[PDB]
Structures are given as C-alpha cells and as structure tokens.
Amino acid sequence: SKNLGGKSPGKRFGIKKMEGHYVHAGNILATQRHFRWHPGAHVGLGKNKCLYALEEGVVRYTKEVYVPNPSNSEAVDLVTRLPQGAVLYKTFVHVVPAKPEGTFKLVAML
Amino acid sequence: RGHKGERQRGTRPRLGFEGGQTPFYLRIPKYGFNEGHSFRHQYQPLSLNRLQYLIDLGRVDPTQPIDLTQLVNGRGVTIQPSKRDYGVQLVEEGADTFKAKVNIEVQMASELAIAAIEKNGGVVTTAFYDPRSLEILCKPVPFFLRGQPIPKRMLPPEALVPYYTDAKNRGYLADPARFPEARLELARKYGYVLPDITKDELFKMLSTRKDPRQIFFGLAPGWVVNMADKKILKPTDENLLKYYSS
RNA sequence: GUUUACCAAAAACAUCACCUCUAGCAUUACUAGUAUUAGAGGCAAUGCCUGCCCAGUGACACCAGUUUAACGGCCGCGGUAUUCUGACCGUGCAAAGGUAGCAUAAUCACUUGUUCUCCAAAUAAGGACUUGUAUGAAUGGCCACACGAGGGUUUUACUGUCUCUUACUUCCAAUCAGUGAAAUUAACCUUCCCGUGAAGAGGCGGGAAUAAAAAAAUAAGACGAGAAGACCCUAUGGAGCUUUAAUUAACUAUUCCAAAAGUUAAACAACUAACUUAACAUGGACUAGCAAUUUCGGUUGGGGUGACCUCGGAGUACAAAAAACCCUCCGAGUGAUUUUAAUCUAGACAAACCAGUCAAAAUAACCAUAACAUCACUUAUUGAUCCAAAAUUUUGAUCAACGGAACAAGUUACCCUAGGGAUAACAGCGCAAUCCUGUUCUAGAGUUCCUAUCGACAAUAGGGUUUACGACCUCGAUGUUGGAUCAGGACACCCAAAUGGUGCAACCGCUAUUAAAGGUUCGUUUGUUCAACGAUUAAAGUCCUACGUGAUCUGAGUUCAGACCGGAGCAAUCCAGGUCGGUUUCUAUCUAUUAUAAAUUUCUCCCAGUACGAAAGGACAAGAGAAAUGGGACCAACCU
RNA sequence: ACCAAAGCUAGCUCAACAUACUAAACAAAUACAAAAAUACACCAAAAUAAAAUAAAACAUUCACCUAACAUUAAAGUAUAGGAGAUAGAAAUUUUUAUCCUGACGCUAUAGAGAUAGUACCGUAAGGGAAAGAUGAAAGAAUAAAAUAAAAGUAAAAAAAAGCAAAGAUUACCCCUUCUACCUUUUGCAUAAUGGUUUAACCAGAAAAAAUCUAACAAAGAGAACUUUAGCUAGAUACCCCGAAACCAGACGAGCUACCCAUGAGCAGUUUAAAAGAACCAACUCAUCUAUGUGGCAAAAUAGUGAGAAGACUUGUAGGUAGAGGUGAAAAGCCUAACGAGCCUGGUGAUAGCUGGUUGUCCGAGAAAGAAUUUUAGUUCAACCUUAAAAAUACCCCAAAAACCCUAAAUUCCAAUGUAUUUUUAAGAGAUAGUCUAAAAAGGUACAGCUUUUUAGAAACGGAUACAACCUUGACUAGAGAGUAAAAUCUUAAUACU
C-alpha cells in the first residue's frame, strides 16, 4: 500500500506531579517533547527536557517573564523583534522547600 | 476445568513456557552465581552468645577441652559434611557479655572472637579437618560401629595452608614461637591485660593439643575400638605403624 | 489386441515399422545365447517428409571438444515503389531467428472470424480464405487404404419417440389366509393466514378454523431419512507425488590415497627412491546413480494474487495519560564534526515481562571551588539468550516473519483425518452503490409552439429482478444450471373490455387512465436462460414463488477419479480455456391434499365500398352465422 | 395378568511362603498332505531394535522401553544437554534371625477372555463370545413354596384447543398462564448438536510453596536433613471416549496382476488359406438401455452388443510379498475400503479439535491491555475469589496543567457524605462480544457492515410477538395494599366570474 508505519506507542509525555503536591528530591515533575513548562526555582532540567525536583517540598506552577540566555541566538532574535512594550511570558514549575536546611543540636557540654 | 481450550483438556504447556515468546528464565544471561558452589567451603557459625548460653546451662562443660564433638553432643551446633560443611566457625556476636573460661578448638575464628576468649584467660586454636575426618569427628559412635581403623587426619589443601600456618589465626599448624607475640598484640589492640595461662590450676587441660594427624583426644590413627568388649586394638605391625604414624 | 474387478473401453496403452543409446561375454536370470545378438528407451504400419540451433541444462569426453529421432529452443524497431502493402534500405539483438506443411482445428481469448454449400429457417456439418503473434515437423508434420459397440453430420427406410394418446394381457396391486423385516423415532394432545423471531413457524403474537376414528391415493412441508460435507477454510493434523527445498546414510557403480602382496637398482653427480596389482577385500576420501529424513511463517472484511510484518513525527485521539483499522500523511536501518563525552549513587519516570528513560549529593579528571558531546524537523538510525571468535576486554545477524526455530521448497481433481456455518460457493436475510419505477423542474428538441411525442442540468420518493457489498441461519449435508410435469401469486396489461389526449380526417398508430375472471403458438441452431432466424397468432406480457417444482422425471451443462490440444511450470501438476467419457438412493410416520354448475375468443356474411377522404384508401355500433379453445358429458356411425 | 423379578454359588484378584521351574497323560500313531510300521543321506545359520511421542514445528537430543543387585542416605547434588526439552551419577553410608498369612479384594454386565481359547468369525497370522440360580429330599411334577414392583403390553381406542402441565375447580376436559431439555454460542422454541425407552455399567489422580489442626520448641525429626520461630505429623490437588498416521515383526498370489510346468477346448458356413481375413454357435467379454438400488445380487436380471484358430479361452500344481511384488501405466491389481495389504505388538500413540463429565443447599462472582509460526491456544497484567494485615479510600470547592484557533469535558485535590481502599499469602477462569446513545474513521454522509474511544443494558413488568429500548437495590409464605414504565399518531387544504 501507499501508507506505512504510522504505528508507534504514545510516549506518555505529560505532567507527573500537579500543583500542591508534595515531592521528594529527584521526583520527576513533568516530561515533554518541546518546552511547554520551563523549570523554575529548585527545579532541575534534564537533557531530554524533563523537569525534576531538586529539593523536598511543594510543587507550584506560575506564569513569568522570559528572558532568554544571550548565548542563544534564536531566542535573542525573537526577543529583539518585539514591539517596545511587549514582554514574553512562559509557564514555570517551582518547588517551595519544606524542611529547614538543617538544625543546631547540642553535642557535648564540656 | 474451564471450557475447551488446552486447559480443559489437561494439556497446557510446561512451567517456564510463556506461549512462545522467548521465556523469561532463558532471556536473562548466564552468570556464575552458583558457579562451583558444590566445592565452596561451609563453616557453620557459632556465636559467643550461644557458647556462653551453652556453658551456663551446663551442656558443654568448660572444664575439659571443647572441640567439635563436644559442641555436637550438646546439640549446640549441627554439622552435615555431606553439604560441604568443613566445621564450626566462631563469631563475635556475644563478645561483650562473654565471661566463661574455655579451651576451644574451631575451624575458623575472627579476631574479635579470639580476643574475647583470651580476655577471660582461655585458649583458642583453629584446626583443620578433611570431609571424611569431619564426618567421623561429629558422629563418632556410628563410626565405631563401622569396624574400621581410625583413619589419619588429612592436611589442609594449598588454599587453606596460609590460614592455618599463621599465629594470627592461632592455627594448629602455626609455629608456637610466634603465638605469645601475636597473642599479646591482640591485648594491645583491644586494651586488656593478658593473663598468664601458665600459673592457672587448669593449665594442664588448657595446653592440650591434638596431633595434626589425629582425630580424637587420646586415641591414635590406626587403632580400632571394640565397643562390645570395651577394648582398644592396636597394630603391632611395622608397616601399619609406619603408615598410620606418618 | 489391452485398460480403471464395482460410475470412464476411449482419441489412453500396446502394436508391426522406423530410430536413438548401452554392452566383446560362460555354468541359476539375460543364456546353455555372442553385435543380423542382448538389454534401456522414443515414436507409431505404409506413403511424402523429418528444416535451423550445442549459447543454457544434461550426457558422453573425467579438462578441451562432441551430441538435439537428448531436455529444450527457433526475434524486432525505423525508412521506402503515385496509394494499402514492402521486393529493397538502415540498424539492434540472438545459439539459431519457426523452413516444408497444415490451419477458426479436440489448438488461450477475440469468436456465433468471413464467405460458399446443405435446411423454410443451423452458434451444427462440410469447402474455402486465414498471422496460428499461443500451429508446426519421431514430446513427430502432412496426405491415404482398410478397420472402430470411438466422436460429429447428412440422405433413404422405418416406426407410439412425438402430434396425442388408446385397448388388452402378465407381474405388481387391493381383499382373504399363513409367516413376518428396514432405515427411522426428545416428547407430542402433530391445523391455516399474516406478523415476529438465530433474519424461511404445527408450537411465539394477532386473527381464523375445528365431533372422533379407520382404509385408499398424491408428494408441497416436516430446512424429510441416508452418510460427524468429498466443495471451502482452519489445524505449528496427515499422507502421496516432484524437484533448482534443507539436512544426508546405506546400497550400486566410478576415481584416488592408505592397507596387503611384491619387484628393481646398489641409486646419481662432483673432487633411500621409483614402479607393479588376478580375484576377493579393509579404513578414509571423490563423483554420480538409487535413495533416506523433514518442512510449507503470519496478517487478510473467505482463501488465493498483490500488499504488509520493526522503529519515529503529524492527524485520527479538539484540553492529564492511553487508544484501533489492508486508516490519512511524512520519515528511519545514519551521516558530519570535535567539545572523545569518567566512577559511584539519593530519588523518580515508564512499564505484563524483557527492555527503555531522567537524575541531586559524593569521588577522580582537567580553569587549579573546571561532567548535558554538537548539528541534520533529533524524535528514529535498531536486535534477547545460547553459541562462536577475541584475550582483558571486547566484537559478531535485512536472526527485516525485526521477543529472534542453529539448518527445510513445490504440488495433490488420487487424497485422508480432525473440526468450522467462528469462514467461502447455492438459497434466504440486511442494505440499495448498480438496477427499476414514478412524480417535481423546464432550458432545449417538436417548421412556429416547453409538457401530441420527448426532454439535458438537477429534485423528491418508492420498488427489491440484476451485479455486487455484509457474513446473520445452516458444513454430525438447506443436493446446484437449463428443460419436462403441474402450476400458486403480483400488476409495473402483451391480448381480450371500457375510456382521456393527439403533430386523432378514415385505416393505422403514438401516448395516458381503469380493469388481473380467461388467455398468452409451433419449429431450425445453442446444454443453454438470453439471442438470431422460419412460420403464425387476438396476443406470443414483465416478474415473484429456495434464479417455484430432482423423497415426481431429465442430466445435455457445470463439479471427482480416465484422456487429448494450446499455454504456464525443471517437474509433480495447473488454467472460471477448449474438447470426448463418466453410479441421480428413499417401502410416506406427521401436516397438507384427493370433482357442483351458471363459457371465452377468433373469423366469415351482412352493415356498405356507406360515415370519413384530393384520391388512394376505408370504419365503429346494431344484426345473422360458422369455427377454435376451455368446462361438462356420450358411442348410432367412423376409427382403435 | 403376561413379559418379567429376586437369590449365592461357581470361580477369580492381590500378596505371603515355598521348594527350586516346561503340569497332566503316553498302548499304538505322530515333522508323507502331523497322528500313514519298513530304504543310501546331506545338514544347517547369524547384522545395533525402530518409531509413534516430548521439544507446543523439526532436523542433535526425548526417562521407562524384555540386558539380575536390593534398601536408608549422599541427591535430583557433581555432571550431560539444539547448555533447550530434558537426562543424571559415584566415592561414601545404612539394612537382625525363624514362626505369628492373609484381605476396610470381586460375587455372574463384577472378578480371569474363560462353563472356553471352546462355539463362532478369518485363506492365514489372528480375533473371540454368551451363558448358572426349587427344596432336607424331585427314589416329594392331581407338585409344593415366599417378588408380582423396570420399559413393553393387557384389564380399558378416541371426542374441538395446541411442549401437554400449572392455577385451579362441585366437576376429566372446557378457562387462564408458560416458545422441551442438553450442548454450543454475541445470540437457539429454533428449521443448530445429541437422545425410542428401561435396567446395569460408564469420567478429577499427585502434596514444591501455601493454608488449617496438633507435638515439641532455639531447636525439631525413631540416622543421613532443615533451622535468624523453626521444625515434625496429619488434612486439603490436578478427568473420559475418539483420528488419519508412524515403526517392527509375522501372515497372505485358493481372489486378482504376470510368469513356470502340465493338461483341455474351438461345431457349422465362406475361402487356393487355421490369413492376429469374413458370417455365426458353444465359449470369452461387457457396448447401450430399462429394470433393480437393505436388491435374486456388498455389481445382478432382461434385451441388445464386441471377439470367437488366437497377442484365444480354460482346468490342475508351482513361483514372485508390502521400503515390496506385478503392471500392453489405469498410479491398475496383490482375498468385497490399496496414492500403498492384513494382523499382532510398540499402544491407554498424539490431538491447541469435537463430544461427555454423576447428591443437596448457601456465600461471593468475571467481556479482553501485552507478547507469541500467535490471533481455534498459551503466559503475563488489569479485574476477581479465599484467607490475613493495616490505613485511609472513593465523592471531591477554590488554586493549578502551552505555545495560532478550538466543544462536551478530563487531570489534580480540602471539606462533606459514606465504608471503602491498599498491602501480604494463596488461586484459577477469562483473554473468539452483541446491540443501544454519544464522538470519530472506513464504506455508498449502505448495511442486523467494519475499526477505536465514553456510557448503558442483557425482567418472571412494558414496547401485541422481542437479547441489547423503557420500568425495576431480583429472599420465603398471604384468597392484603400503594405505585412504575406503559395501550388507536396526526393531518389529509388550492372556486375566482
């Protein structure tokens, strides 16, 4: 026949943890083919463009201003051609850290 | 039985078979895990905890020297040579609580275990038994009904020689010149005063050894135990006595 | 002459004759033979003949080379005689390019080629023409005598084959007497209609009908009885046959090395080897014969043919995930480059399993607090165990049927078994693409004029004949084309009747309405339904009924086993291809059924050569008769 | 009241022991064609077992499989294997006499096939039955005694109407209400399968892990082992019938195919002729038709035909044997079925395929994602069942989830209403699907069509009938009651002087 090989399974791209959930460091928050959600505070980016928590805490989603890295040609060009009042916005994922960094304990009284 | 199919008729395939897709137990690669397992040496562990508990209830008595046969007879331990058990090994589980004073002979021991016995003024020695030897040693009375002489005790194989030649391990083949030195070294390391075994009243029992070629205490290779008459029989022949005593 | 004992007697086989091959020979065949012989085959007497090819494949010759009365093959394109043709010309390719003959044939289709003869009429038969682009010369080609339970055609004659049946005997038959089977059988207290329903009802629904029982008859139904369908498909079910399938023994011949028995020189040059072999006969090889073992991947709107089978992107799948199709579209089975991209480990994604994915901290590398190889839509660029090679640590599959059998093809109509209505062919049912009917709309045809007769582009609705499509009942059988017999029904009327309109003067016609009681021929050819043709008819209707009707018939045709011909295939075998031939069972249990009548149509003669017409032509109604068919009867005569 | 019914014996089965192991009977006759007293010879012999099957195919492999060495262990260990299916040691260990032999074995469809290897069936090898019932006495038959209970009949035919009954009823019918049962299926009154009926026979078997009960317990077991509460014991479990085949060895050529020996037939007519000439009998064939089709006959009868001195018919005796033979090739014939005989054994072959699978009552209860020579099957998930541990489970308001346009709606979650959900241990079935509503795709914007996604259903009430539409949280009894869905649908109209 003319048509061939359209058959491949779904990649299960999606968003694994949702706003308000609790996460432990290293949990994958989302996974994606293109950037849909960008990594925010305490969220690491994988090389496959997936987002994972770097700290134990609570997941939050947010809209924010997007200021691309000047080493990236394309994005800088896109930003440069904008009308003067305009500002790019994107969607971000953060983890609000829950536990205190550490505590001070009494070891020994000399 | 369900309905039609292979199952109602009784014929469903063998166990590992997955329906023709390459079976799970065969797609995994072979790797030595159990490789040469039958030839590995197996030492049944005996903690100081259990040894102490055994002495306390008077199953084994610390008075006379404690070797494998004594442990077996108290049912403190169980050896099955057929499974390639090469004997008892001593582990340190009860070291801190161990107060008894013993002369003990095991086939392997750990530094900490040894130290724990020395501190109380006893003596540990690691001896080797070959499979046949071991079998006879654990169950002597069934051996004596066998009507055979008492065989020589074999030596360790080349792998285990460096173990039994070291005073580190209080090896039965070790050079007794090194013994007091290493024995003191232990006491440096674990910080306890090493008692003088020489000045004790039970000392004659504490120094008691076996010949490296001898299975029991006070019997000798080549004798024969007639248990109905309560007699021992010994070879007077020259060749026999040369063979058994070599 | 022979053959399928029990469905085929033939065109099959054999056969005289003619041809190829193979053998130079002795006590069990051939053969008590000896090349004018004997085996292995081909072809089919006789007659005229048997053309060209050794490139392939064989077989000789163990290689060259030779062989076609060995397997087998024997072509194009362009330009030319004023014109169709193409003697001639050009050129390509082949081992040779189909020669003689015959030819619409028992020869793919076109095909019922064309024409003549035969018949009142022929798809038949015979004679010619003939590119048969698929004839053709010992897998033989062409004539011919005689022969044939072979297959076709004509004439005579004969006849109950038929028009169109009839009488009488015998056996069966029915009654009486004696004896006394078979398949079959859920139970039956066993109706008809329409509806319904696993899509065809004695049993459901709605109606109708209905004292009970024998005996005799008919076969429409009981998807009647028979035989776990022979067609079709499926099964990691068989078997037979053939090989260019994959693995390869024994045996039979060949060839060789070794074994075994031997034999020669005392070898050659200057200052140990080589050769031999009578019959047996061993071990290891070689080449063949004859064989042995085993297999035919799946998906598929039945199988087959074709196509596909793994991985990714987009749609289908509109916003978390997932999500099918022999669904719609693009891709992948890698390049290029240097930044040559380490070890170890919290936690997760994903997930049947196997596989896949991210990743903090910590070490070590390097600026001396220096870990994401980059680009091509970046997503995909891939493959398990075992096992082999490597030696230190790795590498190896269009295993592409891509979760992968270490290595196996055809064919069966000679088939077999197990099943399947889970799946085709017949029939039903659904649907209505195709088909058929009507109406709606008028641009146009009709000299003028849309609708006398038609009617493009389109519209609305029905019917359920065709070819399909679907796979719902039946594969422990619902036996299939056309005839015969008997027909039941619809009306969408062919004839008969009554009318409307006419581009209806009359006769004819062309249309439209109403009407289904009754009718609707005989022949030549085809198996045929169609169709052509001859002769008629008042007319020779269109359809439905399991393309009505095989427990009533037929069997020409399709669809088994035999055989030819053309073609495909190395072969076995095969073709919706032609041709010849080929077993059609049933004693009726149940339902159902087993005779009232009260015509129908033609044609003559009148009507009148009037009505009507320029004439040619030429009526309707009313009125007299005759026939035929159909219903119902009957023998005086005729005839049997 | 017939047909019938009932016995308890015949013997058997499995072991024990045991001497030792071809019984009994032999006058004659027995290996001529066994049972036939008597004439110069011959006589004798061996070659690996194979395959069905398992590997879900099949090619190496596939325990046991007519060879003495037992037992407790080592041990299902070392090893061997398309390193797959499976196969599998040894060293080394253990074993105390003789008597106490019988039976939670059968009772005539059982137990031996057995009253018998007989009758009978096969040419042969070979296959192989059925059958008994009185009593102390039948040297008690005008005979005496206890069942009279199967289907089938008789005593006694039937009377509108309907799966044959049930509600009932004074009353048998008449009335009303119910589409046999198994199997198989998406779905069966089905016109799909099976059964005349009765009796007797006729089909779930195993203890690794587990659960339950108990002993003793850091140990337990009457040796060999296992043990971080275990060990030991007990109890809980996994069918029946069926191919075509394949392999080995016997038996078959008295039918038939072809041979070898040895006999026998062919009259009349026509011809110089006994010439695979002619006419036509006997004889041999088997053309065409009709009968017949459980027949006279497992291939015939009646007519009609073909040959009829030959490649002719035919008797008797002999031969060739299944990987074979024989063949004027029909893949014909080889003892009524030959694409390869028959019989016995291998054999309880093997069937993912069809059929069958036997008391009562109760608790819960299932429609398909993935691989697969796989889509007629399996094995994993998801559901589910039985126990057991727990703690949250559904329902879920804001807030939150993308870049051009985009709906119904999803995801995720407090509260709140409920009592569910998750883990742990066991365990199968199922994995061949229908219609309805919705979103789409394919097709003809066709199908009772096909392929996915969400939802529903599979009444004993309603839609006359009805699978899937609608009503309805399926218990028992009642001669109470209230409700639900639900039963005829409307229109049929055109005057314009």
Ligand SMILES: Nc1nc2c(ncn2[C@@H]2O[C@H](COP(=O)(O)O)[C@@H](O)[C@H]2O)c(=O)[nH]1
């Ligand atoms: N390429 C490849 N072949 C293998 C492998 N394992 C086994 N084989 C098989 O081993 C055999 C080697 O012999 P070959 O046919 O290659 O000469 C083949 O049948 C091959 O299929 C593998 O891992 N890779």
Ligand SMILES: [Mg+2]
């Ligand atoms: Mg896709």
Ligand SMILES: [Mg+2]
């Ligand atoms: Mg998919």
Ligand SMILES: [Mg+2]
């Ligand atoms: Mg069943």
Ligand SMILES: [Mg+2]
């Ligand atoms: Mg099934």
Ligand SMILES: [Mg+2]
């Ligand atoms: Mg142990």
Ligand SMILES: [Mg+2]
């Ligand atoms: Mg015949």
Ligand SMILES: [Mg+2]
């Ligand atoms: Mg014959």
Ligand SMILES: [Mg+2]
């Ligand atoms: Mg003939």
Ligand SMILES: [Mg+2]
């Ligand atoms: Mg015949």
Ligand SMILES: [Mg+2]
């Ligand atoms: Mg011939």
Ligand SMILES: [Mg+2]
């Ligand atoms: Mg000649």
Ligand SMILES: [Mg+2]
């Ligand atoms: Mg000739």
Ligand SMILES: [Mg+2]
């Ligand atoms: Mg020639």
Ligand SMILES: [Mg+2]
């Ligand atoms: Mg050649």
Ligand SMILES: [Mg+2]
């Ligand atoms: Mg040549």
